[PDB]
């Protein structure tokens, strides 16, 4: 069948110092896919990791192609856009919707950690939605392997986005990968339920962070969050990564298992 390998780039999904992401439509089938275009003028690692990903809550990789200095990564398209845009500033979103998004986020993260991969930059802007509002973890440009041959490798590179980064990243030379992603997910949950980020960064020099450690939950954004989800947040946003709740236990949390959302 001729022409089936032709794709028209009909829209720019995202840009920035790294290249661009275009929406591509198959000339024959009209199938939609996202194409990351990078001017070689990192990539090899991202591709390697993407080839390992196979899960309903993680953006799928279809393959790559290059023409000299330009690389083309074909990825699953998420027409729903960023979870970020579903968050109402200073408000958040309905608790049931946030719980559903959180459930899917955990599934994706559990999967990644299961194959020894850490995303390192979990935030609403990197969590995409498909046509059915199903969450998809995207952009593995900062991801890396933390477990190989069943042996865990401690991390030491500072990666991520300050508001979402765990405190140990700023205070310790080495740290475990998993608690870091757990922390990020907690910040994402906060955002979904309060429509605002708790602090610029998790450091003792940051007043907002000191207040949280001092348990002043009567201040925003904590006061806008119901007691059930707030209790979970008290277990996730724990400064000591060794004391921080793990995913297996998040799955046992009361709010996590609380009936709230009717099926579609």
């Amino acid at each position: 069948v001729p022409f089936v390998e032709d794709w028209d780039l009909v829209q720019t999904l995202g840009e920035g110092a790294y290249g661009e992401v275009q929406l591509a439509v198959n000339r024959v089938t009209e199938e939609a896919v996202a194409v990351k275009i990078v001017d070689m003028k990192n990539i090899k690692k991202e591709i390697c990791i993407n080839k390992m990903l196979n899960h309903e809550n993680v953006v799928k990789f279809y393959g790559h192609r290059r023409e000299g200095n330009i690389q083309y990564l074909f990825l699953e398209y998420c027409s729903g856009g960023e979870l970020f845009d579903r968050i109402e500033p200073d408000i958040g979103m309905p608790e049931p919707d946030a719980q559903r998004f959180f459930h899917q986020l955990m599934a994706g993260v559990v999967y990644l950690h299961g194959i020894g991969i850490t995303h390192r930059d979990i935030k609403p802007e990197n969590l995409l939605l498909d046509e059915r509002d199903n969450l998809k973890i995207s952009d593995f440009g900062l991801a890396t392997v933390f477990r190989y041959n069943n042996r865990e490798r401690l991390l030491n590179k500072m990666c991520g986005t300050l508001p979402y980064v765990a405190p140990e990243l700023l205070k310790r030379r080495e740290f475990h990968a998993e608690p870091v992603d757990v922390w990020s997910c907690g910040i994402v949950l906060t955002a979904m339920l309060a429509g605002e980020l708790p602090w610029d960064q998790p450091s003792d020099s940051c007043q907002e962070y000191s207040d949280w450690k001092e348990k002043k939950t009567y201040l925003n954004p904590w006061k806008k969050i119901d007691s059930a989800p707030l209790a979970l947040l008290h277990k996730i946003l724990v400064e000591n990564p060794s004391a921080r709740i793990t995913i297996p236990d998040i799955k046992k949390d009361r709010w996590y298992n609380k009936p709230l959302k009717k099926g579609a």
């Binding site: 390998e5 032709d6 794709w7 780039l9 198959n26 000339r27 393959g63 192609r65 074909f74």
Partner: peptide
């Protein structure tokens, strides 16, 4: 603009 698969 376009690309090949």
């Amino acid at each position: 603009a376009s690309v090949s698969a």
